[PDB]
């Protein structure tokens with residue numbers, strides 16, 4: 001299944017724009033699992049694309065989102081190629097749940 005420990009290690013690339021305490025280039029990911037996309041993050045300025053996506057960050061949507069952000073939400077301002085290893089994606093999600 002998804003392993004938080006492996007996920008903490010795979011989260012390295014995400015650190016550049018995300019943290020769990022404050023907004024920076026990217027919004028804070030605190031409590032992002034199961035939350036509505038582009039609506040929280042203490043008032044972070046989300047793109048119109050994400051905010052109007054109407055998506056809910058469940059495991060299914062996060063899986064697609066991390067594999068290829070722009071294909072899931074054309075026009076997002078999250079500039080990241082995506083994680084092509086499904087197991088790695090699951091690990092990252094297990095990690096996010098801990099936050």
Ligand code: HEC
Nearest residue numbers: 013014016017025026037038046047050076077078079080
């Ligand atoms: C900077 C270059 C980023 C990297 C590297 C990663 N992310 Fe990101 N993320 C970034 C931005 C600018 C945004 C806002 C996107 C927009 O279109 O408004 C995001 C958004 C997310 C979200 C959605 C959060 C929300 O509250 O809906 C998630 C869930 C997310 N990012 C996760 C994520 C992870 C796990 C990354 C590593 C694999 C990662 N991001 C990389 C900027 C950047």
